[PDB]
Amino acid sequence: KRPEGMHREVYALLYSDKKKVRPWKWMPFTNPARKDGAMFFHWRRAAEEGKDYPFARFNKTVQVPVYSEQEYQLYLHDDAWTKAETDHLFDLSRRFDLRFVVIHDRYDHQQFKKRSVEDLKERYYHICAKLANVRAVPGTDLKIPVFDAGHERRRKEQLERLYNRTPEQVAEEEYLLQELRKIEARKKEREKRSQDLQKLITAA
Amino acid sequence: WLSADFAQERRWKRGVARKVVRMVIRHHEEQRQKEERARREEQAKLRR
């Protein structure tokens, strides 16, 4: 007699073709990423009461250099910049992860004269390059690729000119766009073809 | 990571709420359909 006893489809296919004891508890914990020893709380398991906080690894601070007063007075002296004017830049860099698009806004324009983004970045990179050049053993990337602030300035200016284009530099600019191809084709197809046809007529 | 999770979780929570509401509506409708089917079961018992 047919054994079956299982699902119809599977059966036909096969034959027709022969206590928990882990309590969660409210636990305090100290985050190694902090220096003040602030004690926080977390919903942890009982098997790991006391283990280090795992997210502490996500605390890699930016590499903003630190230098002494003597080093500054000796090498980083600048007629246009004073210590009160320079230390604030590095403070903002250390505080905002060394991004100059936010540091410029944070610049205290009350006590300090107005500075652009490009000149602030240039001063920072120049200070870094000087600190490196006055260092030999620590290998602080002696050959830093300091950007050209003037090229950066003119780039910021030309693209800003390309920004505001409402009246005719965005709509009528289609004319100059078509001209970009016309002049690259009409000028050639006229003058070079004139030369070619003159040579042909000479041969003819 | 957490914002995508929160958005998906809000959507899934609203979906589950819709599910449970439709399910209780189905429970009531099926209770009445079960009264009707008890009448039909009286008929089917006559038939048997």
Partner: protein, 96 residues
Amino acid sequence: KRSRKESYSVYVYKVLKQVHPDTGISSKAMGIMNSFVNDIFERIAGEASRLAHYNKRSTITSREIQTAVRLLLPGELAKHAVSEGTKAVTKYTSSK
């Protein structure tokens, strides 16, 4: 106003990546693979339809497809497909 056309490029690239993580596939190779998929689809479907029709049956069932796979695939190739299909059906009816 779009005229979208379908293809198996989505399940073949997935299969390729699950069996060959580092090796890709070109567009024309993908089209050839899709053509092979469609051809085997047609062959198996026609074989199952004809097999069901021989037994005066109006429904193509998993058993018909299983015997069609036994018939079409040659030598030591059918057995593997039949086993895969059976293990997928058993794992499908088990509600996993």
